[PDB]
């Protein structure tokens, strides 16, 4: 059967669900999803029923989304409620810490300040801020109210026990738990700040815009960022305490039925959603308010399938709720993320030589390791500039850059015998790329090509080619040499993948290869002993300049497509300082100094490139926008209209 068993937590919800089930069977045909309704006593009972394969779906708050993720439940977000409008769908809200401009303190200086909270037990006003500040609170940290009462000098914490902790009600005596208290709720907490009662108000990002119409008044307020800096109130997406999803449908991570749940809800909103004017309304009911879904909801959005709960909730939110539930308080070792057996063996050797300073975790793909750095399972890894873009769009920052001597040169190599090829038109020619999304093989060459054809459908511009990472049926996979599953894969099991692989593709099948300036010299003249490269002479290959002219391989300095940003190490902002220090201390111990160490591989370019001489600092360029540059980001923004990165789709869902 294609039945979705929806879980209700009340008798009113079960009645609406039964009405939901009956009306669906009128609009959905024979081969479509049907609804069944399981009634449980609580949200947690619904979570257990779904984990026990007794139900399939339920819509939860963010805190319960975290509960549904923990073992042995292992549920994941599948469908999202959005609000506001269908043209500007609102799925998340941001918990922010608002202060007055020029008040002179940062997030790590809140001790002794006066605080304004929407109310004890609320998300943006209490659970999230106190969660992030948990180990800053004095010991003993339980009961939590007493620890907060000895952190802030005075507060307005509505509904707190002012009898035992009167400091929590200094700004609103009695801590009135109703709108009779002027500083209660979403608006009252900000009024507590606006009226000068407190120094910081923990509210939602939208609270400031609902209480201050003129931007001139909003310019008198700032937000506290977790990096201990301040930003204007309209930059909350780059300066919040946590990004929080409002209402989320969850399901089993394995066993589904995700596709069925979305097909059901998508057809449900098409027939009974907002402004559908039927007898049955998906987002209201005569039996009660907010049954199954919020009455204020406007519809549903499908959660990208790469998304898990920790990625959906976000690193900041998970940190805050973990502290509140576990109560665990300790520069710590840096956890490197390896992508292969030989990369893991190298890191494992690096870790013991570190005597603890470095540790290793492994993942199967580059995107998987990036996700581990995002949620905290891993700490750092080095990436091509194309992945720095993805890592940046997902919230990570670069901390150090690989230096080989301004970065390396992206070149277009062609066979010199074919003296007809020029950069001014390679249409209908066979191309070989390192991989889709990489700097030298894709972002730089195809970025310029986009400016002349105005579309990212490069498989109908070139006749065929090998671009690892393309859809298996693409014409840009026809030239690749991988066998079976490995064909066109962006990894080692595809022989045409990478700098060297793309040059081999040119030598054997292609017409033009997009690689870096040293690729041809180090793979010709016997330097590469493999049969495909052993007898190659580098004077038999040329580069395509932007002029439309061609020059020898060694003349790349005056015949390159563009300068490429160096490979860089990425990490979370909360570990930027510790990674910057430990790595620069380890390269002084194992850098350019069996014979070598860190910058040498048993195979080829493990963890770092082998031509790396140092790990250089970045100064202000600690941001993917400022590291890659405006032109690089603009080009990738043009190319993403044909992107197939599931990790980038998940992060773009949280921050378009
Ligand atoms: Fe609130
Ligand atoms: Fe690269």
From Swiss-Prot:
<comment type="subunit">
    <text>(Microbial infection) Binds to Neisseria transferrin-binding protein A (tbpA or tbp1). Forms a large complex with TbpA and TbpB.</text>
</comment>
<feature type="binding site">
    <location>
        <position position="434"/>
    </location>
    <ligand>
        <name>hydrogencarbonate 2</name>
    </ligand>
</feature>
<feature type="disulfide bond">
    <location>
        <begin position="135"/>
        <end position="329"/>
    </location>
</feature>
<dbReference type="GO" id="GO:0005905">
    <property type="term" value="C:clathrin-coated pit"/>
</dbReference>
<feature type="binding site">
    <location>
        <position position="118"/>
    </location>
    <ligand>
        <name>hydrogencarbonate 1</name>
    </ligand>
</feature>
<keyword id="KW-0488">Methylation</keyword>
<keyword id="KW-0479">Metal-binding</keyword>
<dbReference type="GO" id="GO:1990459">
    <property type="term" value="F:transferrin receptor binding"/>
</dbReference>
<dbReference type="GO" id="GO:0030669">
    <property type="term" value="C:clathrin-coated endocytic vesicle membrane"/>
</dbReference>
<keyword id="KW-0732">Signal</keyword>
<dbReference type="GO" id="GO:0010008">
    <property type="term" value="C:endosome membrane"/>
</dbReference>
<dbReference type="InterPro" id="IPR016357">
    <property type="entry name" value="Transferrin"/>
</dbReference>
<keyword id="KW-0325">Glycoprotein</keyword>
<feature type="binding site">
    <location>
        <position position="438"/>
    </location>
    <ligand>
        <name>hydrogencarbonate 2</name>
    </ligand>
</feature>
<keyword id="KW-0677">Repeat</keyword>
<keyword id="KW-0964">Secreted</keyword>
<feature type="glycosylation site" description="O-linked (GalNAc...) serine">
    <location>
        <position position="30"/>
    </location>
</feature>
<feature type="disulfide bond">
    <location>
        <begin position="225"/>
        <end position="239"/>
    </location>
</feature>
<feature type="domain" description="Transferrin-like 2">
    <location>
        <begin position="334"/>
        <end position="641"/>
    </location>
</feature>
<dbReference type="GO" id="GO:0031647">
    <property type="term" value="P:regulation of protein stability"/>
</dbReference>
<feature type="disulfide bond">
    <location>
        <begin position="394"/>
        <end position="651"/>
    </location>
</feature>
<feature type="disulfide bond">
    <location>
        <begin position="347"/>
        <end position="360"/>
    </location>
</feature>
<feature type="modified residue" description="Phosphoserine; by FAM20C">
    <location>
        <position position="362"/>
    </location>
</feature>
<keyword id="KW-0406">Ion transport</keyword>
<feature type="glycosylation site" description="N-linked (GlcNAc...) (complex) asparagine">
    <location>
        <position position="593"/>
    </location>
</feature>
<feature type="binding site">
    <location>
        <position position="125"/>
    </location>
    <ligand>
        <name>hydrogencarbonate 1</name>
    </ligand>
</feature>
<feature type="disulfide bond">
    <location>
        <begin position="156"/>
        <end position="172"/>
    </location>
</feature>
<comment type="subunit">
    <text>Monomer. Part of a complex composed of SLC40A1/ferroportin, TF/transferrin and HEPH/hephaestin that transfers iron from cells to transferrin.</text>
</comment>
<dbReference type="GO" id="GO:0045178">
    <property type="term" value="C:basal part of cell"/>
</dbReference>
<feature type="binding site">
    <location>
        <position position="441"/>
    </location>
    <ligand>
        <name>hydrogencarbonate 2</name>
    </ligand>
</feature>
<keyword id="KW-0597">Phosphoprotein</keyword>
<feature type="disulfide bond">
    <location>
        <begin position="466"/>
        <end position="480"/>
    </location>
</feature>
<feature type="glycosylation site" description="N-linked (GlcNAc...) (complex) asparagine">
    <location>
        <position position="405"/>
    </location>
</feature>
<dbReference type="GO" id="GO:0009925">
    <property type="term" value="C:basal plasma membrane"/>
</dbReference>
<feature type="binding site">
    <location>
        <position position="567"/>
    </location>
    <ligand>
        <name>Fe(3+) 2</name>
    </ligand>
</feature>
<feature type="binding site">
    <location>
        <position position="61"/>
    </location>
    <ligand>
        <name>Fe(3+) 1</name>
    </ligand>
</feature>
<feature type="glycosylation site" description="N-linked (GlcNAc...) asparagine; atypical; partial">
    <location>
        <position position="454"/>
    </location>
</feature>
<feature type="disulfide bond">
    <location>
        <begin position="456"/>
        <end position="642"/>
    </location>
</feature>
<dbReference type="GO" id="GO:0006879">
    <property type="term" value="P:intracellular iron ion homeostasis"/>
</dbReference>
<comment type="function">
    <text>Transferrins are iron binding transport proteins which can bind two Fe(3+) ions in association with the binding of an anion, usually bicarbonate. It is responsible for the transport of iron from sites of absorption and heme degradation to those of storage and utilization. Serum transferrin may also have a further role in stimulating cell proliferation.</text>
</comment>
<feature type="binding site">
    <location>
        <position position="247"/>
    </location>
    <ligand>
        <name>Fe(3+) 1</name>
    </ligand>
</feature>
<feature type="disulfide bond">
    <location>
        <begin position="331"/>
        <end position="578"/>
    </location>
</feature>
């Amino acid at each position: 059967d294609k039945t979705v068993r929806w879980c209700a937590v009340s008798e009113h919800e079960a009645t609406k669900c039964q009405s939901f089930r009956d009306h669906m069977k009128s609009v959905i045909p024979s081969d479509g999803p049907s609804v069944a309704c399981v009634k449980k006593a609580s949200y947690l009972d619904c979570i257990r029923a779904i984990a026990a394969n007794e139900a399939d779906a339920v819509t939860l708050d963010a805190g319960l989304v975290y509960d549904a993720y923990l073992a042995p439940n292992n549920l994941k977000p599948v469908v999202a409620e959005f609000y506001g409008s269908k043209e500007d769908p609102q799925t998340f809200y941001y918990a922010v810490a608002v202060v007055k401009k020029d008040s002179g303190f940062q997030m790590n200086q809140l001790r002794g300040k006066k605080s304004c909270h929407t109310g004890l037990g609320r998300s943006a006003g209490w659970n999230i801020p106190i969660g992030l500040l948990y180990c800053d609170l004095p010991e003993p940290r339980k009961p939590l109210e007493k620890a907060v009462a000895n952190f802030f000098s005075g507060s307005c914490a509505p509904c707190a026990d002012g009898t035992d902790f009167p400091q929590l009600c200094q700004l609103c005596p009695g801590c009135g738990c109703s709108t009779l208290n002027q500083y209660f709720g979403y608006s009252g907490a900000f009024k507590c700040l606006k009226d000068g009662a407190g120094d910081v108000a923990f509210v939602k990002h939208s609270t400031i815009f609902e209480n201050l119409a003129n931007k001139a008044d909003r310019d008198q307020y700032e937000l506290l960022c977790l990096d201990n800096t301040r930003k204007p109130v309209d930059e909350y997406k780059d300066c919040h305490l946590a990004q929080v999803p409002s209402h989320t449908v969850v399901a089993r991570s394995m066993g589904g039925k995700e596709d069925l749940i979305w097909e059901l809800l998508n057809q449900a909103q098409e027939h009974f959603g907002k402004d559908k004017s039927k007898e049955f309304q998906l987002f209201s009911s005569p039996h009660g308010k907010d049954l199954l879904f919020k009455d204020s909801a406007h519809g549903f959005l499908k959660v990208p399938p790469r998304m898990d709960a920790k990625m959906y909730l976000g690193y900041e939110y998970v940190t805050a709720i973990r502290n509140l539930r576990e109560g665990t308080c300790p520069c710590k070792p840096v956890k490197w993320c390896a992508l292969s057996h030989h990369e893991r063996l190298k890191c494992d050797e690096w870790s013991v030589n570190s005597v603890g300073k470095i540790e290793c975790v492994s993942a199967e793909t580059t995107e998987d390791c990036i996700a581990k750095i995002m949620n905290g399972e891993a700490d750092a890894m080095s990436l091509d500039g194309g992945f720095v873009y993805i890592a940046g769009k997902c919230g990570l920052v670069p901390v150090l850059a690989e230096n080989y001597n301004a970065g390396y040169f992206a070149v277009a190599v062609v066979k010199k015998s074919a003296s007809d090829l020029t950069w001014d038109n390679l249409k209908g020619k066979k191309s070989c790329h390192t991989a889709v999304g990489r700097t030298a093989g894709w972002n730089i060459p195809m970025g310029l090509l986009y400016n002349k054809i105005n579309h990212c459908r490069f498989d109908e511009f070139f006749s065929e080619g090998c671009a690892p990472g393309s859809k298996k049926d693409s014409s840009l996979c026809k030239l690749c040499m991988g066998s079976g599953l490995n064909l066109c894969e962006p990894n080692n099991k595809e022989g045409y993948y990478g700098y060297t692989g793309a040059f081999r593709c040119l030598v054997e099948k292609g017409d033009v290869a997009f690689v870096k300036h040293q690729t041809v010299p180090q793979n010709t003249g016997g330097k590469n002993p493999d049969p495909w490269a052993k007898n190659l002479n580098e004077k038999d290959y040329e580069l395509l300049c932007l002029d439309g002219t061609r020059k020898p391989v060694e003349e790349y300095a005056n015949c390159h497509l563009a300068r490429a940003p160096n490979h860089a190490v990425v990490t979370r902002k909360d570990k930027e300082a510790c990674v910057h220090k430990i790595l620069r201390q380890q390269q002084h111990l194992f850098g350019s100094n069996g014979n070598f160490c860190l910058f040498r591989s048993e195979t080829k370019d493990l963890l770092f490139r082998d031509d790396t001489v140092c790990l250089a600092k970045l100064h202000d360029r600690n941001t993917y926008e400022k590291y890659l540059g405006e032109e690089y980001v603009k080009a990738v923004g043009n190319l993403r209209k044909c992107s197939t990165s599931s990790l980038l789709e998940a992060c773009t869902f949280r921050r378009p």
